[PDB]
Design a protein around this nucleic acid. Structure first.
Ligand SMILES: [Mg+2]
Ligand SMILES: [Zn+2]
Lengths: 717, 1223
DNA sequence: TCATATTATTACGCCAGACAGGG
DNA sequence: CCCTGTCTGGCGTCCTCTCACCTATGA
RNA sequence: UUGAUUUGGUGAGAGG
């Protein structure tokens, strides 16, 4: 009765069943503002029975409590006004059933629904991982007054617009709205109203609505962008931008402070995400909430006006696809004719077949990708001119709404080389896509490849959940409890480099973390930033201008606070712009932010330089050989490639005894080989010269005589 | 030629490959298994006769009486199936067994018995199977699901990597009997051979050889070959066959015949072996360092002194050679222990063995098996001689002996059920051979190594359990038997057999409640192959490879119909053409291919036969003779799909449906969908509710007919003929004379099952689809069941669907529906609820059925009689009264009167009452007042329901728009349902678009026929257009013989086609795209499939024309007013003070653990405090809070949770003193 | 009805943690 | 006496919905 | 002072 998953701790004391709670199937309702959700009248009259009883007893309509329970059991004509007067400013906690991180419980204001389904604002769905394929959510009512204020001031859906795991906005517009924007702000080389001039964005929308221009038709407009270059003062600058009609119509919705160049591009999904991010960093919270709603409304409206279907003709088969398959069939015919005559080995045959089918797969993908990305060729006033296509599946791929390169590849080009459950690949690919028919064997190999994926997700989720449990029970205690621990120690944040191009820049690692000692400017001994400044975006831009090497920054593991973490050694709040407040539980949000992506994770010669810069060596003890190539007498030598500015751009590990084509502090060319060794032969190279003696080397007991067969130059083994 | 309901509406059948084998009867697994169980089959195999011939004749321990068997029988069921479902009894039959007791005198093995007696005794009742493959166990209709388990017979498994943490492989070998003790052999990383019995302790394996009366020398004779050292002129020369030197280093000087063959240092090559065989080299003189490591084979004793020189399996040293050389044993037999091939595993196991003779071997085995209790000669010998060698407690069946002889490459396949010495020795030899290198392991997912149990086998095993209990009872009564004063029912007892067989058919992991909401769902729950159950693997443990699809599933198990979630790939569903082998394996049809010409003869194969042959592909182009039109064709050799020549193949696939099952071969354009979305599509297609008006999929596959007939939901005519059609109650069919018996003049009267409850509260209802005075043939359908339309299979309905974003109302997967869908009642399904009321005599007198309902006023006496119980049929809702059922002394009187649950409406369709003999009948005792009331809610469609197509496109219907706001094309018709195009590039289920275009073309032909028949034309133009519609395109199978339809069957066909011409697009040989375009050109529709659509709101054109077509959309039984729930305050549990759980219990939401972590992640300290103290558990806190709310004071007085004090008392009820400290 | 008191299957996969064995 | 196979215990995802089934004995 | 039993526990199936 104590232990286990169903004891008292895990089943009745940590998790309890709860009154004033409800549950139903969700649906969309896109008319909502993002602080409110739809909630049915029947659930609203059941969850709010005591508030309705109190309201009915206040007016004087009834007397005893019984009378009120008969009134709402009968549901007379007067209790719905009582219900709209108990709802009004009273938030509710919506909760999707697998809550993984804190954005899966958010507080809304109810708007009453004729119906039996919770209407949930669409942007908020990307926080809940809630699609609408049969999902269900629970509603909880904050009873007391402190809980209503916590739902409005901490857990309201307008307050959760940044994910706590990072700095990325979580109210990013998901799928229909980015298609509506990508169709709206685009262009074509001829439309109605090509190259006419417009006195404002208002008559741009008036020309689109009356039927005199097109939504994408390039046009000089006169827009007035407000740049706030002073200290909190918005300065108007008006100019003529060569833009389209749709970019002016979308400029009618952008708030004042953002520049016009945030809408001047084509606006896929990454661009609209950084649009909302720059709006949040400049204009704050309230314009970003109202602008997120206006983005969603105009995306839905012009996606409705777009009529962006999907057909069978939209998946354009490459004309070059059949000749590519026949050239691959001729190549496997040559390899198997060598296999009948035994010239090549079996593993080299299998490797050659997988290599030519990978090459033919890449060529088929490039054929279809050219045939989709620039298929439209329309003339304007004369000879033809090409542009990016308005194919429907290509806008669904290029916009980033739904689709990638691989999925649009499998609908038009060949769907690769599927792998059997043995783990090794199958030498005969699936040359037929989905627009052509798969025959029987090809679909069966496909089912191998997809049954493995479904089994992996349905067994992966248990380990992901148990990982989140272990993480929030090791964290469980750690609360921000001071304001400064009073130290000078902290870890040394450098950009990380594996050996390719510089993977994660320093601005991703030292964004919003308080420096340990004051960072010297890279010239000489300057106080560039002081020693306890939070590094927000302005400081990080003044770090990127000066090309700062690495920052000694304060880390949580170096915090000197007994029983908790001080407010500076944590860093930025991450979903609030400022430092972490005294109190906010960081262990639980950290454990959730590590364990929450557990589902997306999977479950089951020499050095060639790439760029062109300067050489530097670390952990090096070296010697010049007879020929001149600086060989190394240390195993653990790090070969860095430093640029002309001071930051470290490349790093490699060079073994004991390697032939370096270059030396210390030298300038090289891009692509020149600078290192060489033999890993199958461990070098026993020296420091000095002289003659060689065999000390304790006796043939017969110590060493042996193995004269070489095919060469004759013997060696004492 | 066609039958007469085939000429009603003949579906346009694409499909190029001529089918050679028609689809077998889809319920044949269940029916053939249970027809094997009950059948009078002489020669004994298989059935109930096998059980009676195993258990009988019973003779007691020399008690001079021997009860023997004659014959058995099953009488009539006392209750036919309908009144059996109504009453609640099992649908069973009494098992009348003739038993003949003969009783001996003293000294009669051969003497004639002194007296006989014989009677038709009664043991148990066995549940018969309904004609559709179901049981009726206790009123409810259940299905036994066929198991998939490991075959009996030896398996050589490896476990190559994980043990020893050193990369050293092991090799174990399990001899799995069908009934009895498990025997496993296994290596250990010291390269020693170990036996274990029934997963017990580990014994070194040669002790079992020493238990079979084998001395050490006989064991070394078995597992080792002898090397002969002859004592000769000098240094004790060696016989050397040159095979033994293969791959080793020459340690000494290899010379003979005055010639140095191979010197020291170089390894012996096979050319040197050829030199020694050409030079005829056997006897060579060895150094003394060569014998100084070898091991003796047999024993040798010093002859004159009379003592032992060396025991068998002893390594040799030089002084041991000085011992044995001087005695006079000239031959020395040594064990050839090759480090490469012939390893010394048995010999080192003999060195591990602490035993020496047979008796100590049996004592050690008895101390392993049964510990504590002493090991004496009789007890240990009886144990080991009945472990494997008696016919009672160890029995490899015929399957087990076939697999056991097949895995050891024996010639025969039939043998005795027990093991022997030679079988255990052969398993050890094959295991050693696998360790040496020759031969390989077996895999467990290979469906030649994986048998199917079915209903007859499982019920026969349970019946054999009951019979061995009743024979132990008969042996009990007979030795205490006094004669002649007993007749054979004081000996025998009907109780244990009935108890065991009702234990299996009631409470087992495979006798389970039938998914009955759909003809598809019935017919695909009966064809189910579960890996679970008794003796099989579990859901929460294993694994990765048994959840995965293996290349022997091609044509035996559906690759794509397996339920997603916790059990994927354990609950496999059987393929369309796959029968079951004689031994229980899965054999699938193939077409025998002797030479170039592919012959139309079929031939069935299992996976241990499919590997040897080369089997072609279903769709490989062959023209007019069977010759493959290419010179190379894709086949598969040994589970490897590869390209072979024109003339090498021995078999071809029969038809191209045969890979998948009957759930996922109803999906048209399957080959264009992804595998994941075909899985989700088939699993949702099982879940469809039957609509009120069944509607004929325009894009089907033609397998709708076989599923709708073979699942017994339609009233298929038994004997052909005409009709009398009284039908209000029953279809009356007059029989044609050729099918009519000479006596029993006879006309067939079919019973239509009208509105009644299914197992999933849906409505199963049959409607006659034949008129009066109309010819029907044998096998034709007469009454359309639930979800059927003229014998086809109509799960959902076909609706006009536009693919576009429409103002956000179809955002993620939502679906936006017109009002024309909800006005026409074209999804308004009918649900039926059974509600029981009983008035049991709990305590303080019996309860009572009277209208004189108390406290409650004239709001009780209303939908009832003048004095009790709901009248018959009104529009009852929630909070009404159905059966007044309240007691006095329970003012102190109360209201238990079964009412209507909260939120439901309906019409009382039926009231059953077999009550306590007095209500003013046939039922069991105990229960007194038994009133069952059948409501029938009619649920329409609403924002929040779930619809889905056949391709995996799920959706929660979001907005129910008016007709005006819909996107209308320029012809004027609104579109019915708007889906979302963004699902289609990601979820790669592109088949729904081809279904959309081809359904658009189907309704294009239907609109064209509706114009030609409404604006009425004489039938020449209709038969010309129908002939053009049925020719249409490439080489197909259908064409039609349309000029023989008598100028009226053209018109009745064209009356049944004016809603759209139905098109069969088969599974993998479906309609190509050019035929879709060509059919869209026959109708007057645009070729692209896309029409320009205007907007109903703004009246102005959508740019970039959108896709409109007809998709067959289904309503799944996840309805929103079965999920909507809310709770403010009501009842809680007993032990804890927290609220109850569920909806049927009016309970609240479990605010689980991760939600508490999410509130801790915010600063919600007060929200969490009321979330676990006031709202949930603390009783003083929640009563003070309810009074504080209704006063108008939102403030909580928290206190301590009650379940924590429950924790304190449960911890404190140990020896633990947990407290609560200082203030 | 009112006290009497427990036996003839096996088929997870790591991963720590404690224990007798032996160079 | 320090490595070492070997054995024994202790984990293994949250939320929800539907249905059926429940110890023998006994003067 | 104006009324009542599932949670308990197993098995099977389903949804996200
Ligand atoms: Mg979903
Ligand atoms: Zn600190």
């Amino acid at each position: 009765m104590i232990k286990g998953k169903q004891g008292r701790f895990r089943q009745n004391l940590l998790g309890k069943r709860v009154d004033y709670s409800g549950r139903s199937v969700i649906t969309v309702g896109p008319y909502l503002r993002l602080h409110q959700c739809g909630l049915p009248k029947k659930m609203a009259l059941e969850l709010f029975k005591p508030f309705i009883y109190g309201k009915l007893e206040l007016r004087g309509l009834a007397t005893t409590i019984k009378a009120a329970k008969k009134m709402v059991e009968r549901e007379e004509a007067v209790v719905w006004d009582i219900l709209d007067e108990v709802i009004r400013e009273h938030p509710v906690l919506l909760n999707r059933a697998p809550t993984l991180h804190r954005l899966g419980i958010q507080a809304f204001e109810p708007v009453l629904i004729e119906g039996k389904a919770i209407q949930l604002h669409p942007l908020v769905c990307a926080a809940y991982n809630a699609d609408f394929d049969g999902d269900q959510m629970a509603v909880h009512v904050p009873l007391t007054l402190e809980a209503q204020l916590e739902a409005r001031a901490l857990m309201m859906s307008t307050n959760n617009i940044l994910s706590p795991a990072n700095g990325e906005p979580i109210i990013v517009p998901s799928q229909d709205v980015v298609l509506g924007l990508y169709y709206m702000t685009r262009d074509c080389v001829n439309a109605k109203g090509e190259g006419m001039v417009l006195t404002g964005p208002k008559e741009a929308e008036r020309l689109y609505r009356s039927g005199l221009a097109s939504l994408h038709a390039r046009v000089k407009v006169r827009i007035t962008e407000y740049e706030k270059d002073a200290n909190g003062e918005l300065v108007a600058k008006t100019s003529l931008k060569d833009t389209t009609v749709g970019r002016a119509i979308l400029w009618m919705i952008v708030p004042k402070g953002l520049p016009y160049s945030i809408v001047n591009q084509a606006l896929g999904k990454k661009a609209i995400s950084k649009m909302l991010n720059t709006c949040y960093r400049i204009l704050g919270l309230k314009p970003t909430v109202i602008f997120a709603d206006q983005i969603m409304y105009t995306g839905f409206a012009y996606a409705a006006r777009s009529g962006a279907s999907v057909g069978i003709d939209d998946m354009v088969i490459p004309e070059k696809k059949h000749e590519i398959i026949s050239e691959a069939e001729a190549e496997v015919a040559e390899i198997q004719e060598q296999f009948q005559s035994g010239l090549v080995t079996a593993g080299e045959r299998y490797n050659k077949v997988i290599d030519i089918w990978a090459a033919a797969n890449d060529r088929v993908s490039k054929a279809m990708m050219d045939n989709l990305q620039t298929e439209t060729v329309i003339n304007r006033d004369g000879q033809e001119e090409k542009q990016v296509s308005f194919n429907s599946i290509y806008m669904m791929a290029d916009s980033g709404a739904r689709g990638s390169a691989a999925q649009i590849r499998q609908l038009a080009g060949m769907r690769g080389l599927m792998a059997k459950p043995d783990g090794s690949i199958i030498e005969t690919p699936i040359t037929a896509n989905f627009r052509e028919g798969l025959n029987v064997l090809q679909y069966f190999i496909s089912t191998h490849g997809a049954r493995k994926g479904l089994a992996d997700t349905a067994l992966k989720t248990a380990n992901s959940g148990y990982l989140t449990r272990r993480l929030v029970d090791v964290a469980q205690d750690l609360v921000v409890t001071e304001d400064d621990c009073g130290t000078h120690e902290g870890i040394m944040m450098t950009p990380v480099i594996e050996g390719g191009d510089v993977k994660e820049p320093l601005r991703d690692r030292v964004l919003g973390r308080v420096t340990a000692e004051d960072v010297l400017k890279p010239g000489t001994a300057d106080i560039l930033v002081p020693r306890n400044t939070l590094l927000h975006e302005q400081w990080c831009d003044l770090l990127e201008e000066n090309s700062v090497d690495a920052v000694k920054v304060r880390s949580v593991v170096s915090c000197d606070t007994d029983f908790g973490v001080c407010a500076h050694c944590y860093g930025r709040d991450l979903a609030r712009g400022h430092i972490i407040n005294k109190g906010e539980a960081i262990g639980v949000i950290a454990a959730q932010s590590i364990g929450e992506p557990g589902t997306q994770l999977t479950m089951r010669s020499s050095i060639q330089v790439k760029n062109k810069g300067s050489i530097k060596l670390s952990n090096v003890k070296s010697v010049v050989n007879s020929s001149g190539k600086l060989v190394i007498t240390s195993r653990n030598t790090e070969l860095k490639l430093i640029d002309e500015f001071g930051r470290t751009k490349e790093s490699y590990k060079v073994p004991y005894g390697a032939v370096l084509a270059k030396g210390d502090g030298e300038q090289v060319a891009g692509g020149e080989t600078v290192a060489n060794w033999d890993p199958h032969t461990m070098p026993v190279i020296t420091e000095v010269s002289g003659f060689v003696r065999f000390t304790d080397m006796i043939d017969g007991q110590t060493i042996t005589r193995q004269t070489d067969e095919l060469t004759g130059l013997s060696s004492l083994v | 030629v066609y039958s007469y309901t085939e000429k009603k509406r003949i579906r346009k059948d694409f499909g190029k490959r001529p089918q050679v084998l028609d689809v077998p009867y889809l319920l044949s697994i269940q029916l053939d298994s249970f027809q094997k169980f009950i059948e009078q089959d002489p020669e004994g195999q298989y059935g109930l006769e096998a059980a009676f011939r195993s258990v009988f004749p019973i003779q007691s321990y020399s008690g001079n009486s021997e009860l023997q068997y004659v014959s058995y029988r099953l009488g009539e069921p006392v209750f036919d199936v309908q009144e059996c479902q109504i009453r609640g009894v099992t649908y069973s039959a009494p098992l009348r067994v003739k038993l003949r007791l003969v009783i001996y005198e003293r000294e009669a093995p051969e003497g004639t018995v002194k007296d006989i007696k014989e009677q038709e005794v009664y043991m148990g009742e066995i549940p018969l199977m309904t004609d559709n493959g179901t049981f009726v166990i206790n009123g409810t209709e259940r299905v036994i699901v066929s198991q998939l388990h490991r075959s009996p017979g030896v398996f050589f498994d490896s476990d190559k990597g994980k043990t020893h943490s050193s990369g050293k492989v092991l090799y174990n070998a399990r001899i799995i009997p069908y009934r009895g003790s498990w025997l496993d052999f296994e290596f250990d990383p010291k390269d020693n051979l170990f036996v274990r019995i029934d997963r017990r302790r580990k014994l070194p394996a040669t002790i079992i050889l020493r238990a079979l009366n084998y001395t050490t020398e006989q064991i070394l004779d078995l597992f080792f070959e002898k090397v002969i050292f002859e004592i000769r002129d000098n240094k004790l020369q060696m016989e050397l066959v040159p095979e033994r030197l293969r791959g080793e280093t020459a340690s000494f000087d290899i010379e003979a015949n005055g010639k140095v063959y191979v010197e020291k240092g170089r390894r012996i090559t096979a050319r040197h072996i050829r030199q020694l065989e050409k030079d005829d080299v056997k006897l060579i003189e060895v150094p003394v360092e060569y014998i100084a490591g070898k091991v003796v084979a047999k024993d040798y004793i010093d002859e004159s002194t009379g003592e032992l020189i060396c025991a068998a399996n002893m390594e040799l040293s030089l002084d041991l050679l000085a011992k044995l050389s001087q005695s006079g044993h000239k031959r020395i037999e040594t064990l050839f222990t090759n480090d490469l091939d012939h390893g010394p595993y048995i010999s080192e196991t003999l060195r591990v063995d602490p035993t020496n003779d047979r008796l100590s071997a049996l004592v050690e085995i008895y101390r392993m098996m049964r510990p504590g209790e002493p090991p004496t000669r009789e007890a240990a010998e009886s144990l080991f001689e009945n472990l494997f060698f008696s016919e009672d407690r160890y029995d490899l069946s015929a399957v087990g002996r076939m697999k056991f002889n097949r895995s050891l490459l024996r010639e025969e396949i039939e043998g005795s059920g027990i093991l022997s010495k030679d079988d255990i020795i052969d398993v050890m030899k094959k295991l050693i051979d696998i360790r040496n290198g020759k031969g390989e392991v077996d895999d467990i997912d290979h469906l030649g190594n994986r048998r199917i149990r079915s209903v007859g086998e499982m019920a026969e095993n349970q019946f054999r359990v009951g019979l061995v209990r009743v024979e132990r009872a008969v042996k009990e009564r007979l030795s205490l038997g006094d004669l002649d004063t007993l007749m054979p029912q004081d000996m025998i007892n009907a109780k244990p057999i009935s108890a065991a067989v009702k234990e299996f058919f009631g409470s087992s992991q495979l006798s389970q409640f039938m998914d009955q909401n759909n003809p598809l769902s019935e017919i695909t729950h009966k064809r189910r192959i579960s890996a679970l159950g008794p003796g099989g693997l579990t859901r929460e443990r294993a694994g990765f490879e048994v959840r995965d699809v293996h290349p022997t599933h091609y044509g035996r198990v559906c690759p794509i119909e397996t339920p997603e979630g916790p059990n994927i790939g354990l609950i496999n569903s059987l393929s369309v053409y796959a029968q079951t082998n004689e031994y229980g394996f899965l054999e699938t049809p193939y077409r025998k291919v002797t030479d170039g010409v592919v012959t139309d003869e079929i031939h069935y194969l299992s996976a241990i036969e499919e590997g040897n042959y080369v089997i072609a592909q279903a769709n490989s182009n062959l023209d007019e003779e069977g010759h493959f039109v290419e010179d190379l064709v894709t086949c598969r050799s040994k589970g490897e799909s590869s390209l072979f020549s024109r003339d090498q193949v021995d078999y071809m696939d029969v038809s191209t449906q045969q890979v998948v099952s009957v759930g996922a071969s109803l999906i048209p354009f399957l080959e264009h969908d992804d595998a994941n979305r075909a899985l989700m599509g088939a699993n949702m297609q099982r879940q469809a509710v039957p609509t009120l008006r069944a509607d004929k999929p325009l894009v089907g596959t033609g397998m709708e007919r076989a599923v709708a007939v073979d699942s017994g939901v339609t009233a298929v005519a038994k004997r052909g003929g005409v009709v009398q059609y009284v039908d209000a109650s029953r279809i009356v069919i007059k029989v044609n004379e050729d099918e009519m018996y000479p006596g029993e003049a006879g006309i067939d009267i079919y019973n239509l099952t009208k509105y009644t409850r299914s197992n999933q509260n849906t409505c199963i209802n049959q409607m006659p689809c034949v008129s009066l005075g109309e010819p029907v043939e044998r096998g034709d359908v007469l009454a359309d069941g639930p979800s059927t339309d003229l014998g086809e299979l109509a799960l959902g309905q076909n609706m006009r669907v536009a693919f576009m974003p429409w103002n956000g109302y179809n955002f993620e997967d939502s679906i936006l529906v017109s009002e024309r869908v909800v006005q026409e009642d074209r999804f308004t399904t009918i649900h039926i609820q059974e509600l029981a009321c009983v008035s049991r005599d709990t305590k303080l007198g019996p309860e009572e059925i009277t209208a004189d309902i108390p406290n409650v006023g004239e709001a009780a006496l209303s939908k009832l009689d003048e004095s009790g119980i709901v009248y018959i049929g009104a529009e009852v809702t929630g909070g009404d009264i159905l059966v007044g059922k309240v007691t006095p002394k329970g003012s102190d009187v109360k209201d238990s009167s079964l009412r209507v649950p909260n939120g439901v409406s309906g019409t009382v369709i039926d009231v059953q009452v077999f009550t306590r003999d007095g209500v003013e009948d046939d039922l069991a005792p105990g229960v007194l007042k038994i009133v069952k009331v059948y409501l029938a809610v009619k649920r329409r469609i609403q924002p929040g329901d779930k619809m889905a197509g056949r391709h995996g496109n799920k959706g929660v219907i979001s907005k129910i728009n008016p007709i005006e706001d819909m996107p209308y094309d320029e012809n004027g018709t609104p579109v019915d349902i708007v889906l979302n195009p963004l699902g289609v590039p990601s979820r790669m289920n592109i088949g729904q678009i081809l279904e959309t275009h081809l359904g658009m073309a189907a309704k294009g032909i239907g609109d064209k026929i509706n114009a030609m028949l409404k604006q009425q034309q004489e039938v020449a133009k209709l038969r010309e257009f129908i002939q053009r519609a049925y020719d249409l395109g490439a080489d197909v199978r259908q064409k039609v013989d349309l000029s023989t339809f008598s100028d009226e069957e053209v018109m009745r066909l064209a009356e049944n086609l004016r809603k759209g011409m139905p098109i069969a697009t088969p599974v993998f040989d479906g309609a190509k795209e050019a035929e879709i375009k060509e059919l869209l050109k026959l109708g007057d529709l645009p070729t692209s499939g896309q029409i320009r659509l205007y907007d109903g709101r703004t009246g102005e054109q959508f740019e970039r024309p959108v896709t409109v077509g007809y998709m067959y959309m289904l309503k799944l039984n996840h309805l929103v007013d079965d999920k909507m729930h809310a709770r403010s305050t009501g009842s809680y549990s007993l032990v804890t003070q927290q609220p109850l759980g569920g909806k049927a219990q009016f309970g609240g939401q479990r605010f689980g653990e991760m939600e508490v972590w999410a509130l801790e992640a915010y600063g919600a300290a007060y929200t969490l405090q009321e979330m676990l103290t006031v709202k949930s558990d603390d009783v003083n806190g929640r009563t003070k809070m309810y009074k504080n709310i209704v006063d108008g004071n939102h403030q909580m007085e928290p206190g301590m949770p009650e379940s924590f004090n429950v924790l304190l008392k449960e911890i404190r009820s140990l020896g633990i003193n947990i407290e609560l400290e200082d203030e």
